[PDB]
Design a protein around this ligand. Structure first.
Ligand SMILES: [N+]
Lengths: 225, 225
């Protein structure tokens, strides 16, 4: 039910390590192009490097407020703006997870709205940090945060930063997200997706985009180049 | 050679988890007050909560560009400025570690300089991510980043975010930092300091400030309140 080419067409091939250099990013783009993936995803200061080498047809995503989500709205929004100016066409922003856990959904809304309005032409993905929302609160909060993101104009909800100790994507989280907002928003599964078996599980749960760092190993699990 | 009171007077009592709430920060401030520490350190969106309950004498540190360091200079500087407006008196910024590893020390300098100029009256600490500089390059790079921080006007160098897989403070790192800039700059040891024995090792190596999250257990190892 999943060919390598189909999967590749929904992969964001990602490098977000603090120690990443320009050479690491040009190597990421070369790998992304070789694998035929949808996008590369990089940190804000490295967008320009990615944009300078990406072929037409490889999208560029940047993260905003990442990984912690602990930035005021105006900073997230300006970071997003600057990344789009540098060549990103998609932004993956992190919510203030603590605001969500505190029940301050009006603050979560305001944050997403600030970013949305700063990058109105971009594809905006909202990282909800689902493993943390599920661990520290539960399913209702995860569903509610997804509704907040929808109502604030996000294009996607996304599971995870890959940096939080509660973990990454789970089938349970993706199913909740897809059932809550999947009729209107994309669902990006990310964090800890290392194998084709895992990727397939996420796609079957309702993911429409995958965020991978080891994309070649995942894709090889679906078939040969 | 260290009394409890002396150690407390150089502790920054810290909470930086993504899931931190306002009430978590109010509790942090109360604990810091009870322990008689120098400062509390919190994330930018939580500075005003901390400032709103901090007793007389307690300094407030905010992180900037944290934890990844992967933010453009204009964002780090504006984040710092906003945190000072919210009540911070100190800023602990993170360098772009990848820029340092690429040999782009001019970029590192420009980043520190931008923050320095935006918060001229604050105490500025520069997190060098010493465990990563040592792992991926070595001692000369650590010393050179300290020289850059000094020349860009920083008040302190600081070992670690506590979030990087390379690790936290080490005696080796503190000794290099102290040798390089300790006659002019403070040296803050942070990341993984859980016990009095570890804290004392860092102080003996040349640290003049400690970043702790479990400050009571450290202080109780030195003696009674
Ligand atoms: N000094």
């Amino acid at each position: 039910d999943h060919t390598r080419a189909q999967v590749a067409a929904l992969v964001d091939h990602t490098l977000l390590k603090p120690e990443a250099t320009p050479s690491d990013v040009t190597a990421l783009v070369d790998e992304a192009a070789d694998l035929g993936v949808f996008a590369v995803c990089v940190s804000p200061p490295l967008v320009s490097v990615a944009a300078g080498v990406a072929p037409s047809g490889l999208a560029i995503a940047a993260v905003a407020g990442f990984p912690s989500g602990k930035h005021v709205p105006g900073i997230k929004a300006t970071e997003a703006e600057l990344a789009v100016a540098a060549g990103a066409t998609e932004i993956d922003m992190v919510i203030d997870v603590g605001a969500a856990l505190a029940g301050d959904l009006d603050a979560v809304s305001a944050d997403i709205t600030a970013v949305r309005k700063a990058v109105r032409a971009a594809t905006l993905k909202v990282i909800v940090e689902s493993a943390a929302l599920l661990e520290f609160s539960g399913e209702p909060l995860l569903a509610d945060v997804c509704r907040v993101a929808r109502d604030a104009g996000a294009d996607f909800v996304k599971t995870s930063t890959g940096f939080h100790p509660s973990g990454g994507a789970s089938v349970q989280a993706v199913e909740i997200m897809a059932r809550t907002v999947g009729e209107r928003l994309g669902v990006k599964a990310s964090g800890g997706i290392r194998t084709a078996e895992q990727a397939a599980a996420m796609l079957d749960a309702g993911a429409t985009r995958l965020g991978l760092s080891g994309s070649r190993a995942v894709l090889d699990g679906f078939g040969s180049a």
